[PDB]
Amino acid sequence: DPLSETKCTLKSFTVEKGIYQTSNFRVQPTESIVRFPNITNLCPFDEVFNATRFASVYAWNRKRISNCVADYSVLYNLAPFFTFKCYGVSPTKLNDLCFTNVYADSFVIRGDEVRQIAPGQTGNIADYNYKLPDDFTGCVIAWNSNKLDSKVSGNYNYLYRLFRKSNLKPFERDISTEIYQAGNKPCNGVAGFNCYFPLRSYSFRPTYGVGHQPYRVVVLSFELLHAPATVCGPKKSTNLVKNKCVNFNFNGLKGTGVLTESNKKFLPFQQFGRDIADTTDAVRDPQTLEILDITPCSFGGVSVITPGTNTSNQVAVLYQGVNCTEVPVAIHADQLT
Amino acid sequence: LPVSMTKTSVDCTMYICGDSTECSNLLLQYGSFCTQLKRALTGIAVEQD
């Protein structure tokens, strides 16, 4: 009862005459809704991961996956090890997040150089063949390739770069094979000292150790922007409710509030809206394309007017900023009172 | 000559956390800042009158 809440706030068993601010009241949510895109196909994940004929480190292939459904549960079809590090996002069953645009890169590198595929690393591969940005968001997957990339004489189809003029900007591809002159002389010759051909093969032989074993690596680069989200995950939709408190998941955006019809002149390109406080205030349903206004559930402060406990025990309650009709009646439990 | 000033009240949980419950659970673990802030604001409000 209000008197006991006043006692708990004051940390005393006896209260004097006055008015005390105890706590706040707010209407607790009822249902749950989820609206996600309507696409039903599946993303070309199986045309990059397996990829019988594969790519080299200095000409790494790039695939642009768009307008499909992403299921990251179907990845456990390979031998273990599956090193597997996601930066800026966790993979522990977080395939429930929509995404703007996804890049897939793939290359084979050596054993000890798998650690070089990470932000803030300096090394031969890091500054000569492939460099991630400092604030990169995405995932890196690595696995062994002895069973599929082994040959008796060693495969020369795999090469890497050791010498170049300077470092690489993030996500930059170099294919040039022009000679690299070092000391003073003009070179312009096929071979000779200071006249270097900037490519060296791996020569992978099964007789080598684990640290020399070929490793195949795939890198997924994600993007989060103010876009309709093309790619997404397998989350079922749900009929939307209006004029009624409801926690919602609109295309990856979680919130809680009363969703109503809005009459704000959204232009065709505009996706959502914001207010003075830099918060979401209007959203477009990505199945009916209707603008909806968001307004949180009623809330306010509660005060207890009481004479001294030595005088009586009955109290009065003041709800601050409420029009005496928005005072909730409650059904079983929908108030923090 | 000015005499009085506008009386303001601040709700901790709705400002810091908002519509998140786990944030409130973590916020329970950072002491009694909210009691101090609410008490100071109430003192100013009474002083104005």
Partner: peptide, 28 residues
């Protein structure tokens, strides 16, 4: 008369303004 949506935006973040005890008529 010489001294004079933002209020709603402030209120939705937990910042409210309380009324005075004495109205203008009483001061007058």
């Amino acid at each position: 008369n010489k001294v004079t949506d933002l209020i709603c935006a402030q209120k939705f973040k937990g910042l409210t303004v309380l009324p005075p005890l004495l109205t203008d008529e009483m001061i007058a």
